[PDB]
Design a protein around this ligand. Structure first.
Ligand SMILES: COc1cc(Nc2nccc(Nc3cnc4ccccc4c3)n2)ccc1N1CCOCC1
Length: 285
């Protein structure tokens, strides 16, 4: 019942290539409440794909059928009939948060706190649903037309950010520069490690997306972040942000704040709209 007739979907220009195939920018006609057409992002599957990739695709989308938070890119619909298979989702005109930020290269705080607070509301919602994003960083956060930041389209894939990952012991691609020291060590991902990445996302927002630990190598990151090293407070960083940052980089994961606690601490520095849309104020919470 998330099924949509191809008739209702247009497609208007390629955005780029996604893990499972080309992802387009388009329009849908029967996908929102009281809204004729709606700008949407269309995700197709390569024609070469194995019958197993068409079942990974269709399953990654079956995952979001359980989500519904204003701060996590939404799944508007699937076209599971005919071909090319289509997954339809809320369009984020401004794109990924890392690019956006790299764009602004010469934010207030009202603006930096609004980003942080939406991302955190997204996470709080996810963790609340027993979900643990395991690759939370600017690049996997998208920015909407109205500048809202959302935890969108899970992971995405490859792209211009290959340097963002490394294969600790040649065992596959991991975002080490965003990973908690306990993860680096043991390799396990938790909501606490999610909070660790959150503070790196915050650090990204203050440095307009610089590369975490730039003067270091990936092999050097691992040593440094595992031994109790942290990032420096950036040039003109608001004493508040950085304070929130190292609340997140507490070595012991249990001494770290939760995402809800993080919102609660900035609950009143955020635009008036938050309260009526967020998860934090939702009865769900
Ligand atoms: C991050 O990229 C963008 C996202 C959106 N919005 C959006 N909303 C909702 C879902 C979504 N899904 C995906 C998923 N995987 C992709 C993999 C590769 C490329 C696009 C992808 C889009 N995307 C709009 C423009 C851009 N861009 C950024 C860079 O090139 C210029 C265009």
């Amino acid at each position: 019942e998330w099924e949509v007739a191809r008739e209702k979907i247009t497609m208007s220009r390629e955005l780029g290539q996604g893990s499972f195939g080309m992802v387009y920018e388009g329009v849908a006609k029967g996908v929102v409440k009281d809204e004729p057409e709606t700008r949407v992002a269309i995700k197709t599957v390569n024609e070469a794909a194995s019958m197993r990739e068409r079942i990974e695709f269709l399953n990654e989308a079956s995952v979001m059928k359980e989500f519904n938070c204003h701060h996590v890119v939404r799944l508007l619909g699937v076209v599971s009939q005919g071909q090319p298979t289509l997954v339809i989702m809320e369009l984020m005109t401004r794109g990924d948060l890392k690019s956006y930020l790299r764009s602004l290269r010469p934010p207030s705080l009202s603006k930096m706190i609004q980003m942080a607070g939406e991302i955190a509301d997204g996470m709080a919602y996810l963790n609340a649903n027993k979900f643990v994003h395991r690759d939370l960083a600017a690049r996997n956060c998208m920015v909407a037309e109205d500048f809202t930041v959302k935890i969108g389209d899970f992971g995405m894939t490859r792209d211009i950010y290959e340097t963002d990952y490394y294969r600790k012991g040649g065992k596959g691609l991991l975002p080490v520069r965003w990973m908690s020291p306990e993860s680096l060590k043991d390799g396990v991902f938790t909501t606490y490690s999610d909070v660790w990445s959150f503070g790196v996302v915050l650090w990204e927002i203050a440095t307009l997306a610089e590369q975490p630990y730039q003067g270091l190598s990936n092999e050097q990151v691992l040593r440094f972040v595992m031994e109790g090293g942290l990032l420096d407070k950036p040039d003109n960083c608001p004493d508040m942000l950085f304070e929130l940052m190292r609340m997140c980089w507490q070595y012991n994961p249990k001494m770290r704040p939760s995402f809800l606690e993080i919102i609660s601490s900035i609950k009143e520095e955020m635009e008036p709209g938050f309260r009526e849309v967020s998860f934090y104020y939702s009865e769900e919470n």
